[PDB]
Write the structure tokens for this entry.
Amino acid sequence: IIYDDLSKQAVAYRQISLLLRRPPGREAFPGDVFYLHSRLLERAARVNAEYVEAFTKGEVKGKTGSLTALPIIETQAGDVSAFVP
Amino acid sequence: AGAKDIRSKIASVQNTQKITKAMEMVAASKMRKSQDRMAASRPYAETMRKVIGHLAHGNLEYKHPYLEDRDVKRVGYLVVSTDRGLAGGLNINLFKKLLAEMKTWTDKGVQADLAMIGSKGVSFFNSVGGNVVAQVTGMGDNPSLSELIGPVKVMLQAYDEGRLDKLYIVSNKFINTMSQVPTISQLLPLPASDDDDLKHKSWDYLYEPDPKALLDTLLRRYVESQVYQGVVENLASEQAARMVAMKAATDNGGSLIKELQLVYNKARQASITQELTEIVSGAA
């Protein structure tokens, strides 16, 4: 899965958040901005066969599932030290 | 204080960059003038070389201490150096090559001493602690042979009285605008390869008063011309090195300015955002 402009997502939370009067943090993003990406990205993982068997209810055995992710982030003036990057 | 001082630092770096940009062109023009002087210098030296070759390699062959080979027990150098800074590593490269050769001669147990042109060599070799017998400084542009007459006179006095057995001139060579090389070449005894001729010494010169004193004066004037030409060429090489160093310095300043501007812009945005968050929060 290749999310495009995860940055363009973060700008959108700020709007829904500032429209909800939630206090902004560094720059103008709300403190929850780390939770937003952390809970989205953490789903990309490789799971052992036992989890697959438990989820499938025994239909699939001995196979490990996986989900690779390639998030894209856009930096102003090549500044890798910005908040969101 | 990004809002207070970084804006001043940027301006200072801009001013320094413009000054270096001007210095590069000044050096480039002085290099052309030094090239003209250097090209003017050669024909007198080559004509005197032709005359000394005729006198030495004529049908009747004379012998002179400045000309005859002598065994080595002491070795001497005279070194040219800049009187002004910048000019990159020219001086240090020349000095370390001279030190390499001096160490090579020391390993053979040969005592060495130096004659010095320019204050940079004076300072470096005083720090090294090498024997310096003569010094001349403060020529700047348009150096004169009249000042040079001294050190060459004392080095000649050392050479002909037995104190010195070989003499080298240490200087950088103006190969071209883009490249210069530190070099060492022999002056005494006369290293020039022999030559042969028929017209000369057949329709021989009438000698007044006698051929020998004229040969002594001729050889002295020749070595003096050699060291003057070396000095001029080293000055031209200095100008070229300064031009290059100023180009590098201007590029470095131009590279620093943009990073300072990026930092200043980050600070500028951050201050506005913080102060507006404060204003909005204060309206409870």
In short: The two ends of chain A are 19 Å apart (CA to CA).
